[PDB]
Amino acid sequence: PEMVRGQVFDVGPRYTNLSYIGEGAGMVCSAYDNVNKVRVAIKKISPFEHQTYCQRTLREIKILLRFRHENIIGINDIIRAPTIEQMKDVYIVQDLMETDLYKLLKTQHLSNDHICYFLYQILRGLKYIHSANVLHRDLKPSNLLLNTTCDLKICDFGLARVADPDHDHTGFLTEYVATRWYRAPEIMLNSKGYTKSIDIWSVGCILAEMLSNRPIFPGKHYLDQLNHILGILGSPSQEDLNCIINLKARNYLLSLPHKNKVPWNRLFPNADSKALDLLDKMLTFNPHKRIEVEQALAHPYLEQYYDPSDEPIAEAPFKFLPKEKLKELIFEETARFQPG
């Protein structure tokens, strides 16, 4: 059994020369693949004690194995014990990606051509995810992986769900799991984050962050996230308020001092005007009025890239429980990788 930091990282004999990386979810390391002759990334997952983490591990593995797209991280291999009883960890092998958009934005100015290109690839991947009736629900720069030629792949489907717009309504101040700064305004008001518009918001936030290297709405707590949003978009219109039937959420918005829109061209003076037109459409307060992924692809900003015949959709969309049974399902889901 190979060791890294005095812990089992048991992956051989296909994957040799381990270098440590981090502590993502369990721990992460790189390694040399001996069948394909490329180095790879390997995540150790240990979820069998908790039914919640079984559900998340199973959801991510099921989704990633269903999906096949250039702009979504694939699972190359899964390593685990030959029996349920001996299975204590799972190792997920993926393409080694030299960096991510979070890291890149910490030290690199992005040219307008890079921003355009990254945005295109994000939306191309998202078109596919949405076409499978899946919501990612945690899009943010650290979940966008990049290699040295700037190919981009969406990762981390741990919070992803099958779309469920008929059951999206909730009361005011409902607790939310996904990363605060990329949460759409409606999450804090009346939304469980079960519609596609939740992801387009996050993409809008990422576009803004790409332009300035700084998060656009860095809220310090749950309702501060909404005050950051309204300080730029301005107070919602009566029409957009009329769409919020929940009284607590409506009265909260009514209680706030009036705030006027900050023009995008003042926040981002060096930005391409077409980039700002698209940004405005993704960062729209009203989720029903917010641009759809396909409309965003078709926007003049992306005209150099847009090619719907080369923007594939999912062949097999996702149409629609104790940890003991989920361990069996994870074991089952990962069976295809066993020597055979």
UniProtKB/Swiss-Prot annotation:
Residues in Protein kinase domain copies: 15-302
Feature: DNA-binding region: 248-266
Enzymatic reactions: L-seryl-[protein] + ATP = O-phospho-L-seryl-[protein] + ADP + H(+); L-threonyl-[protein] + ATP = O-phospho-L-threonyl-[protein] + ADP + H(+)
Role: Serine/threonine kinase which acts as an essential component of the MAP kinase signal transduction pathway. MAPK1/ERK2 and MAPK3/ERK1 are the 2 MAPKs which play an important role in the MAPK/ERK cascade. They participate also in a signaling cascade initiated by activated KIT and KITLG/SCF. Depending on the cellular context, the MAPK/ERK cascade mediates diverse biological functions such as cell growth, adhesion, survival and differentiation through the regulation of transcription, translation, cytoskeletal rearrangements.
Effect of D307N: In NS13; results in increased MAPK signaling; increased translocation to the nucleus; reduced interaction with DUSP6; no effect on interaction with MAP2K1
Cofactor: Mg(2+)
Cellular component annotations (GO), alphabetically ordered: azurophil granule lumen; caveola; centrosome; ciliary basal body; cilium; cytoplasm; cytoskeleton; cytosol
Family per similarity comment: Belongs to the protein kinase superfamily. CMGC Ser/Thr protein kinase family. MAP kinase subfamily.
Superkingdom of the source species: Eukaryota
Protein name per Swiss-Prot or TrEMBL: Mitogen-activated protein kinase 1
Active site: D138 (proton acceptor)
Organism of derivation: Homo sapiens
Compartments where found: Cytoplasm, Cytoskeleton, Spindle; Nucleus; Cytoplasm, Cytoskeleton, Microtubule organizing center, Centrosome; Cytoplasm
UniProt short sequence motif TXY, positions renumbered to this chain: 174-176
InterPro entries: Kinase-like_dom_sf, MAP_kinase, MAP_kinase_CS, MAPK_ERK1/2, Prot_kinase_dom, Protein_kinase_ATP_BS, Ser/Thr_kinase_AS
Disease: Noonan syndrome 13: A form of Noonan syndrome, a disease characterized by short stature, facial dysmorphic features such as hypertelorism, a downward eyeslant and low-set posteriorly rotated ears, and a high incidence of congenital heart defects and hypertrophic cardiomyopathy. Other features can include a short neck with webbing or redundancy of skin, deafness, motor delay, variable intellectual deficits, multiple skeletal defects, cryptorchidism, and bleeding diathesis.
Note on domains (UniProt): The TXY motif contains the threonine and tyrosine residues whose phosphorylation activates the MAP kinases.
Residues bearing PTM Phosphothreonine: T174, T179
Residues binding ATP: I21, G22, E23, G24, A25, G26, M27, V28, K43
Record text on subunit structure and interactions: Binds both upstream activators and downstream substrates in multimolecular complexes. This interaction inhibits its tyrosine-kinase activity. Interacts with ADAM15, ARHGEF2, ARRB2, DAPK1 (via death domain), HSF4, IER3, IPO7, NISCH, SGK1, and isoform 1 of NEK2. Interacts (via phosphorylated form) with TPR (via C-terminal region and phosphorylated form); the interaction requires dimerization of MAPK1/ERK2 and increases following EGF stimulation. Interacts with MAP2K1. Interacts with DUSP6. (Microbial infection) Interacts with HIV-1 Nef through its SH3 domain.
Disulfide bridge map: none
Short motif Cytoplasmic retention motif, span: 307-311
Keyword Cell division carried by entry: no
